[PDB]
Design a protein around this ligand. Structure first.
Ligand code: A1D47
Ligand code: ZN
Length: 313
């Protein structure tokens, strides 16, 4: 049931046991469920919550901000990404990414906080850096050569409906900055990224994922192999069938998301997005109540394992 690189079943359980669903739901998810369109008092609130939550970690994450400003239909706008790098001097790193801005809808409609789009991912990343903190802290003390980088991207969502120059403000910029910064080896910080794992649209019930990239299908398989186990170990909730989320296959082929600026620059990209989109994207019906906490806590579990098998924690 396990491939090569896999964890031993004893660790895995020990690991899993470090996850704390109440923290996930009540510490990191519930307070992101505000409205956080770019340059909003809430888009600010969240940005600062992220910065300070991650900085509170023992492992010593080096958390920088990527503040900038860009011309957009609603005029000039003040964006700000949150780049948290566990070990900046290490040569390459796994990058988990997701955006923390909520799309902007017209005024008056019920306010849109996009539970799945993308707070549940933002929260997952947090719980993962916390659960596995001491483990990640070890690796960093023992000079591990591949570390972990958490990107919380602002300004994914258009402001006056999609378009190349009105979309992905946050990603398009950090990929621009990252390409300017030299790195040894490298030559740029863009090559630091050994793999761009992009979470988006997670937390709706009964999702389905696929390999939109054959460059990285190796890791999707693993992601699928990590599902069952856990199913075969009675460690997933509401998981009657064995493979359910990570299905086998190939295309669509692509859907436009925060990974794009980095693929132009030749980065390996695992797009980890629900295809199809939840039945609630893009409505004011994307709210804490329409999620499926089990499905959330399994994705967290799967991811947590992956992270441990990937960085050899
Ligand atoms: O922002 C948007 N408003 C729309 C309204 C109608 C259809 C749409 O999709 C078309 C257009 C581009 O995307 C795929 C088909 C969109 C849309 C795109 C989109 C895609 C993936 C995302 N992940 C997080 N926000 C996302 C937004
Ligand atoms: Zn969205």
């Amino acid at each position: 049931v396990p491939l090569i690189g896999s964890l031993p079943e004893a660790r895995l359980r020990r690991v899993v046991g470090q996850l704390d669903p109440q923290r996930l739901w009540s510490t990191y998810l519930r307070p992101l469920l505000v409205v956080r369109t770019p340059g909003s008092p809430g888009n600010l609130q969240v940005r600062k919550f992220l910065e300070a939550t991650l900085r509170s970690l023992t492992a010593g994450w080096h958390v920088e901000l990527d503040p900038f400003t860009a011309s957009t239909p609603l005029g000039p706008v003040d964006f700000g990404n949150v780049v948290a790098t566990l070990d900046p001097r290490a040569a390459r790193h796994l990058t988990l990414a997701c955006h923390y801005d909520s799309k902007l809808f017209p005024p008056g409609s019920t306010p849109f906080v996009g539970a799945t789009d993308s707070a549940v991912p933002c929260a997952l990343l947090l719980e993962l850096a916390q659960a596995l903190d001491l483990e990640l802290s070890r690796a960093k003390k023992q000079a591990a050569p591949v570390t972990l980088q958490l990107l919380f991207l602002d300004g994914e969502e258009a402001l006056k409906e999609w378009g190349p120059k009105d979309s992905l403000y946050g990603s398009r910029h950090l990929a621009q900055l990252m390409e300017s910064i030299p790195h040894s080896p490298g030559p740029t910080r863009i090559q630091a990224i050994e793999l761009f794992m992009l979470l988006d649209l997670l937390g709706a019930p009964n999702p389905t994922f696929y390999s939109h990239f054959p460059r990285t299908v190796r890791w999707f398989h693993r992601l699928r192999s990590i599902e069952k186990r856990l199913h075969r170990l009675n460690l997933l909730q509401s998981h009657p069938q064995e493979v359910m989320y990570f299905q086998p296959g190939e295309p669509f082929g692509s859907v436009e998301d925060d990974h794009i600026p980095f693929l132009r620059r030749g980065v390996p990209v695992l797009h980890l997005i629900s295809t199809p989109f939840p039945a609630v994207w893009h409505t004011p019906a994307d709210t804490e109540v329409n999620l499926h906490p089990p499905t959330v806590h399994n994705l967290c579990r799967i991811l947590a394992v992956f992270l441990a098998e990937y960085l050899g924690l």
